Nucleic acid binder design. Structure first.
Length: 1088
RNA sequence: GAUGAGACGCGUUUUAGAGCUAGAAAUAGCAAGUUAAAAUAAGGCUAGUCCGUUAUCAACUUGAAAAAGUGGCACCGAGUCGGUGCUU
DNA sequence: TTGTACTGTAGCG
DNA sequence: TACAGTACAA
C-alpha cells in the first residue's frame, strides 16, 4: 500500500524514484493516448528530469540599462535639436533631416548626400579646414568672429552626446589637477609631522618629472635628483612611491599620525592622473581636450608620413601588406580593419625590431603613443567638467551673436550636466515593474524642470524601503550596514569571545581590551595585547594566546571614522547617541548624490555644525550587513534576560558564540527565531528566494511530486527523502504542501515525513559497497542517486536487499525526460554583418534592406511548427503537397501567434490545414525504427536521444580501472580493487563491442565507428589508466544531447552532425509528461 | 550570495570625407587614411526621457484567461520494457 | 536545382 | 553548438 519517494535535485537535473517497504521499484501498465497502435506501455517508477540551467537576471539588467542609456542619449540630442530648431531651421531648412538620413544609401536619401552643407564644395572646404571635430571645437572656443550656426550645433551635439564621466564631483580646478600645489601640501604635512630635518621644497615640474615621461619607478630617481637631501628609499621616496601606486617599505621608514601623509600622497597621485590624461595639460590655456587631440592628429600625420617613407625605402617587401592589404593587422588593418592599437603595435614591433633606425619611433610604441586615434578606449577617464567648460566657452563666445544662446545657455548646460539621481529611478507613470518614483505633478519631465516635478522626499523614502535588504536569521527585519557601528562591534566581540589566554576572557577583560586597544587603533595584533594590556594592566609577564593567531580580522573602522569627523569622543561613547549615529550610517550607505544626503543630515545641525558637516558630507559607505538590530540587541532571553550581544559581553566561564547561541536549545532564542521565521502554486513560488540555478530545481521537483501523486491515485507517501540560500527551502514548500491537516492539540499531523539527507552519507554508501557511478556513460546516475537516497533515508528512519539494490542499479528501463522549452532571449547573435546579396541577413530596421545596409545573423528559433500545405514550385506551376517543419523565431513568435494562418501564407504555404498545425518546442522527442530516438534541437537540427543502459558490473569495471592509485583507503582494499579489475580486463574488449552495437543501432556514425575501432585496435597494448580514461571519453559518442568532439589517445574525432530533420516527418512524436510516465504518441506518418 | 538604480568609454553597421596616372583590361603603380552623422535588440501603446533577452511553458477536455479535470491491479521475467492472470 | 560535408562563426570594461 | 559559408554528389 504505502510507498516512499526519493529525490535528488541539481542545477540541471531532478532525479526521482518510488520504492516500497521492500526497497523495490514498482512497474505499472500506463495508458497511452494518440492515434498509434500502442495503448499501454509497461513503465517503471524511476527516472530523472533533465533541463536547461536557470539564468540570473543580470544580462537582462545590463541590456536594459544600456537600452535606457541609448534612449536618454537620443533624448538629449532631441532636446538640443528642439532648442536649436527655431533659429537653425531658418539657417538651413533641411539640416536635421540630412543628419537623420545620413545613414541611408543615396537612392534612399531624399536630400543631398552631403550631411552638413549639402554642397560638395563647402563639405570639402569643411573637411580641409577641420579634419577632425576637435579642430572645429578648438576654433569655436578660440574665435571671436561670427561662426556658422550649424557648426556650433555639431560642436555641442558631439559634446552632449559624448559627454564624459561623473566620477568627480563639483568643478575641476588646478588645485586638484596641477601636481605642484598638492606636492606643496604633502611636503607641508610631512614637515609638520616631524619638524626635525624637513625637506622644504617648492612645486615640481610634473609634466616631465612625475607624468608618463618619467612615471612609476623612474620618478623615484628623477625627482630625487632635484632634491638629493632625501632618497628613493627614504620616507619622501615612500610618499612619492605611494603617489605612484607602489608598495614602499613603510616599516623600514617608520599609528594614525602618518595617515595624513598617506592620504596626501593619494591625492597627489590623483593629481598626476588628472595631469597625464591630457597631453597639453597646463602647457596652454585654450580648449585643453581639443588642443590635446589636435596635437595627437598632428603627431599622427607626421609619424605616419615618416613611417611610410622608411618602409618604402628600406624594406619595400610587405609595403602592400602594411598599407594596402587591410587584413594582416598593418596600418591599413589598423584603420580600415578590425585591428586594435595593441595588435597593430604587436604586428609592427618585430618588424620595427628588424628595420634600422626605428628607435626614435619605437619608443612611441613603448610609451603607447604611436599613431593613436582620437576615439579610443582610453577616453573613459575624461571628466564631464571638461566638456562642460568647453561648451560654456562656446556659448560665452557666441552669446551676443545668437540671442537664443543667451536665452538658453543654462538650458544647454543643464542638458549636458543633468544626471538622473541614484535614488529616483526610471521616470515612469506606473507602467514599469521597476520604477518607484512619485510625481508631484502630471507633465513631461525635462532636465530644466526636474527639480519641481519629482517629489524627492517620497521617491527617496520608497528607495529606502526597496533597497534595504532583510536578515537571513529573521527575514522580516531590516539589516544593518556592514559599516554600521553595532555591526562592527558585533563582529569584534564575536571574534574576541573565542580567545583563551594562558598565564576564557571575562566581561571586564573584554571591555577593557576594547576600550584601550580596539577603540584606539585600526589594527590590533597579539603582540599589542600582550605588551600594552597584559603586562601594562594585568601585570602578566608571559601570556599565551590561542584564540587569535596574528591579528584581529574584525576592526572598528566606522568608529574611528566618526571619531575623525567629530572629535567629541564621549559623544561616541554615549549610548543615547547610538540611534542617531545609526541613522547617519544608514544615510551614507543608501545614497551617493550630495543633495538628498545634505537633506537627511541637515536635521542634526543643532547637535554639531560647520567643519564637521562640511567634512562628513564627503564620506560614503558601500555594502550591507548580514544582521539586524532586532537580533543583535533585539530579542531577549526569558530566563537569562540577555540578548545575543549581552551574552557576547559576558557569559561566565565558558564563552558562547553567536552560531552556538543559535545552536543551543537550552535558551528560547531558537524558539524566538523559528516562531518568527515562518512567512495557487504559481502564487506560492512567486515570492521565494535563492539563486535562479536552484529555484528551477525546486519548482520542478514539486511539480514532479505533483505528477507522482497524480499517478498513484492521489495516495500520499509515508516519507519523502530530500538531498542536501536554499538550506531550509529544500524542505519548506513540500512540508507545507504535503502536511495540510491539523488538530486543536496537535499543531500539525505528520502524514508525510520529509527526511533530509547529506550527500556524504549516500556517497559513502556508494563507495563502500561497490555500487559505483560515473557521469559520462548515461544520465541514469541521477535516478540511481535518488533511489539510493530513498533507500538510505527509509533505512535510517526504520533503524536479499543487496540483491534488490544491485538489480535496481542494473535495470535498463529508466524514464529519462528532457524538458521541452520554447526558447527565449535575444532573437539573433549581436554582431552586425556587412552588406551582401544573401537573403539570410536579418533586417536591422523595417525600412533598412539588409542587401544594402547589412544586418544580423544566426537567428534563434523559439519553437518549430509542423505544417502541411501546397507550395508553389516549378516554372510550369502546379500545387504540390508537402509536409515539413518550419522554425518560428523569437522575433516572429508574436506575429505567428496573432494569426498563424496569415503568417503561413506569408511564407509561401497555401491551402494550409489549420487543425494539423502542431507546435514542436526544443527537445521534442521522436521515435523511429529499431527504437531509434531523435531529439529536435531546431527546425534543421536533431540530437541524440537514446540511453546506453550498460550493465552495472562493467560500470564497476570502468570505475575501478580509473583512479587506479588514488583511492586513499587501505592497502588491502586498494590492491584488492587492482587485482579484481585486472581479473576482468576482457570486459574492455567486450565493452568496445557494446559501444559498437548500440552506436550502429541508433547513432549511425559509421565513419566515426571505424575511426574509434582502428584507434582502439592500434592502441590495445597501452596500460589500464590512460586506456580506461579514453574509453570514458568515448561515451561522448553515445551520450544523449548534441554531438560533441571527444578525443582518444592522440586522434580527435569530429562530431557527426544530424543537420537534417526530414526523417522525423514520418516518425512517432512522443509528448512526454514531466515524469514521463504518461505519454501521448502521435504517428505523424498518418498526417498528410 | 540573490535583486534594483544611474553613468561613461570602446566596438559594429551604412553613408559623407571629390582619389591621381597608365590604361581595349582582367588590372598595374602612386597618393590617401586618425573624423562625423544614424542605429544598437525588429518594435509595442496605457505615448512614459516607459516597456521589450530574467522567470514561466508535455498532450487532450472545459474555461477570455486565471485555473480545474483528464490514464486499473497482482505475479513472472528483462536491451530502453515484455509476457501471464483477474477486473469493469 | 537540391541535399550533404567540412570548417568557421560567436560584441566588453 | 546552432547556424553560415564554401564546396561538391545527384
Amino acid at each position: 500500500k504505502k510507498y516512499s519517494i526519493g529525490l535528488d535535485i541539481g542545477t540541471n537535473s531532478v532525479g526521482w524514484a518510488v520504492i516500497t517497504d521492500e526497497y523495490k521499484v514498482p512497474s505499472k501498465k500506463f495508458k497511452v493516448l494518440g492515434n498509434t497502435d500502442r495503448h499501454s506501455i509497461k513503465k517503471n517508477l524511476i527516472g530523472a528530469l533533465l533541463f536547461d540551467s536557470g539564468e540570473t537576471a543580470e544580462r537582462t539588467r545590463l541590456k536594459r540599462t544600456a537600452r535606457r542609456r541609448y534612449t536618454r542619449r537620443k533624448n538629449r540630442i532631441c532636446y538640443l535639436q528642439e532648442i536649436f530648431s527655431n533659429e537653425m531651421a531658418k539657417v538651413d531648412d533641411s539640416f536635421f533631416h540630412r543628419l537623420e538620413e545620413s545613414f541611408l544609401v543615396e537612392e534612399d536619401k531624399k536630400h543631398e548626400r552631403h550631411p552638413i552643407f549639402g554642397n560638395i564644395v563647402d563639405e570639402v572646404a569643411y573637411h580641409e579646414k577641420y579634419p577632425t571635430i576637435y579642430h572645429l571645437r578648438k576654433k569655436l572656443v578660440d574665435s571671436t568672429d561670427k561662426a556658422d550656426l550649424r557648426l556650433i550645433y555639431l560642436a555641442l551635439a558631439h559634446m552632449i552626446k559624448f559627454r564624459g564621466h561623473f566620477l568627480i564631483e563639483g568643478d575641476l580646478n588646478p588645485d586638484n589637477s596641477d601636481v605642484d600645489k598638492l606636492f606643496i601640501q604633502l611636503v607641508q604635512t610631512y614637515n609638520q609631522l616631524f619638524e626635525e630635518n624637513p625637506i622644504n621644497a617648492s612645486g615640481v615640474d610634473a609634466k616631465a618629472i612625475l607624468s608618463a615621461r618619467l612615471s612609476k619607478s623612474r620618478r623615484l630617481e628623477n625627482l630625487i635628483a632635484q632634491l638629493p637631501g632625501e632618497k628613493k628609499n627614504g620616507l619622501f621616496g615612500n610618499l612619492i612611491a605611494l603617489s605612484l601606486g607602489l608598495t614602499p617599505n613603510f616599516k623600514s621608514n617608520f599609528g594614525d599620525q602618518y595617515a595624513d601623509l598617506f592620504l596626501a600622497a593619494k591625492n597627489l597621485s590623483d593629481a598626476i592622473l588628472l595631469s597625464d590624461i591630457l597631453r597639453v595639460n597646463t602647457e596652454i590655456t585654450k580648449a585643453p581636450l581639443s588642443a590635446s587631440m589636435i596635437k595627437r592628429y598632428d603627431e599622427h600625420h607626421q609619424d605616419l608620413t615618416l613611417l611610410k617613407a622608411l618602409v618604402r625605402q628600406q624594406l619595400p617587401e610587405k609595403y602592400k601588406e602594411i598599407f594596402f592589404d587591410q587584413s594582416k593587422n598593418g596600418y591599413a588593418g589598423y584603420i580600415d580593419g578590425g585591428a586594435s592599437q595593441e595588435e597593430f603595435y604587436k604586428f609592427i614591433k618585430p618588424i620595427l625590431e628588424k628595420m634600422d633606425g626605428t628607435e626614435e619611433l619605437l619608443v612611441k610604441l613603448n610609451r603607447e603613443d604611436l599613431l593613436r586615434k582620437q576615439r579610443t578606449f582610453d577616453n573613459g577617464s575624461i571628466p564631464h567638467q571638461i566638456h562642460l567648460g568647453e561648451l560654456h566657452a562656446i556659448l560665452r563666445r557666441q552669446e551676443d551673436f545668437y540671442p537664443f544662446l543667451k536665452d538658453n545657455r543654462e538650458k544647454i548646460e543643464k542638458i549636458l550636466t543633468f544626471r538622473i539621481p541614484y535614488y529616483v529611478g526610471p521616470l515612469a507613470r506606473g507602467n514599469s515593474r521597476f520604477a518607484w518614483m512619485t510625481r508631484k505633478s502630471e507633465e513631461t519631465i525635462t532636465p530644466w524642470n526636474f527639480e519641481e516635478v519629482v517629489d524627492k522626499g517620497a521617491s527617496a523614502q520608497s528607495f529606502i524601503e526597496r533597497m534595504t535588504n532583510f536578515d537571513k536569521n529573521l527575514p522580516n527585519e531590516k539589516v544593518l550596514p556592514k559599516h554600521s557601528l553595532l555591526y562592527e562591534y558585533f563582529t569584534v566581540y564575536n571574534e574576541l569571545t573565542k580567545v583563551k589566554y594562558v598565564t576564557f576572557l571575562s566581561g571586564e577583560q573584554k571591555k577593557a581590551i576594547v576600550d584601550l586597544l580596539f577603540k584606539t587603533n585600526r589594527k590590533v595584533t597579539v603582540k599589542q595585547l600582550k605588551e600594552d594590556y597584559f603586562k601594562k594592566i594585568e601585570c602578566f609577564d608571559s601570556v599565551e594566546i590561542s584564540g587569535v593567531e596574528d591579528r584581529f580580522n574584525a576592526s572598528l573602522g566606522t568608529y574611528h571614522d566618526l571619531l575623525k569627523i567629530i572629535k567629541d569622543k564621549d559623544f561616541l561613547d554615549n549610548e543615547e547617541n547610538e540611534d542617531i549615529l545609526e541613522d547617519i550610517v544608514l544615510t551614507l550607505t543608501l545614497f551617493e548624490d550630495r543633495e538628498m544626503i545634505e537633506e537627511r543630515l541637515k536635521t542634526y545641525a543643532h547637535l554639531f555644525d560647520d567643519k564637521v558637516m562640511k567634512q562628513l558630507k564627503r564620506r560614503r559607505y558601500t555594502g550591507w550587513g548580514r544582521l539586524s538590530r532586532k537580533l543583535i540587541n533585539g530579542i531577549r532571553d526569558k530566563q537569562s534576560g540577555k540578548t545575543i550581544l549581552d551574552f557576547l559581553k559576558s557569559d561566565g566561564f565558558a564563552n558562547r558564540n553567536f552560531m552556538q547561541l543559535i545552536h543551543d536549545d537550552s535558551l528560547t532564542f531558537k524558539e524566538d527565531i523559528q516562531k518568527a521565521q515562518v512567512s495557487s502554486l504559481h502564487e506560492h513560488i512567486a515570492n521565494l528566494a535563492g539563486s535562479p540555478a536552484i529555484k528551477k530545481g525546486i519548482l520542478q521537483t514539486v511539480k514532479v511530486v505533483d505528477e507522482l501523486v497524480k499517478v498513484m491515485g492521489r495516495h500520499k507517501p509515508e516519507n519523502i527523502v530530500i538531498e542536501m540560500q536554499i538550506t531550509k527551502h529544500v524542505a519548506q514548500i513540500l512540508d507545507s504542501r504535503m502536511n495540510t491537516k491539523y488538530d486543536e492539540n496537535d499543531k500539525l499531523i505528520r502524514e508525510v515525513k520529509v527526511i533530509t539527507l547529506k550527500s556524504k552519507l549516500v556517497s559513502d554508501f556508494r563507495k563502500d559497497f561497490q555500487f559505483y557511478k560515473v557521469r559520462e556513460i548515461n544520465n541514469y546516475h541521477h535516478a540511481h542517486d535518488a533511489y539510493l537516497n530513498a533507500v538510505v533515508g527509509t533505512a535510517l528512519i526504520k533503524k536479499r536487499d543487496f540483491a534488490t539494490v544491485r538489480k535496481v542499479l542494473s535495470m535498463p528501463q529508466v524514464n529519462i525526460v528532457k524538458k521541452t522549452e520554447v526558447q527565449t532571449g535575444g532573437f539573433s547573435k549581436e554582431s552586425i554583418r556587412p552588406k551582401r546579396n544573401s537573403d539570410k541577413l536579418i533586417a536591422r530596421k523595417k525600412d533598412w534592406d539588409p542587401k544594402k545596409y547589412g544586418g544580423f545573423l544566426w537567428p534563434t528559433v523559439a519553437y518549430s511548427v509542423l505544417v502541411v500545405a501546397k507550395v508553389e514550385k516549378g516554372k510550369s506551376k502546379k500545387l504540390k503537397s508537402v509536409k515539413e517543419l518550419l522554425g518560428i523565431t523569437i522575433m516572429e513568435r508574436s506575429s505567428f501567434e496573432k494569426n498563424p494562418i496569415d503568417f503561413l501564407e506569408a511564407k509561401g504555404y497555401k491551402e494550409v490545414k489549420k487543425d494539423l498545425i502542431i507546435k514542436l518546442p526544443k527537445y521534442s522527442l521522436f521515435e523511429l525504427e529499431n527504437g531509434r530516438k531523435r531529439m529536435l534541437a531546431s527546425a534543421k537540427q536533431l540530437q541524440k536521444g537514446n540511453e546506453l543502459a550498460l550493465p552495472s558490473k562493467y560500470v564497476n569495471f570502468l570505475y575501478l580501472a580509473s583512479h587506479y592509485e588514488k583511492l586513499k583507503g587501505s592497502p588491502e582494499d586498494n590492491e584488492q580493487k587492482q587485482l579484481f579489475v585486472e581479473q576482468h580486463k576482457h570486459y574492455l574488449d567486450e565493452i568496445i563491442e557494446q559501444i559498437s552495437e548500440f552506436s550502429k543501432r541508433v547513432i549511425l556514425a559509421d565513419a566515426n565507428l571505424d575511426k574509434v575501432l582502428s584507434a582502439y585496435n592500434k592502441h590495445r597494448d597501452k596500460p589500464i589508466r590512460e586506456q580506461a580514461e579514453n574509453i570514458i571519453h568515448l561515451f561522448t559518442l553515445t551520450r544523449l544531447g548534441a554531438p560533441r568532439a571527444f578525443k582518444y589517445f592522440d586522434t580527435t574525432i569530429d562530431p557527426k552532425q544530424y543537420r537534417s530533420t526530414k526523417e522525423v516527418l514520418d516518425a512517432t512524436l512522443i509528448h512526454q509528461s514531466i515524469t514521463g510516465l504518461y505519454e501521448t504518441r502521435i504517428d505523424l506518418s498518418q498526417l498528410g
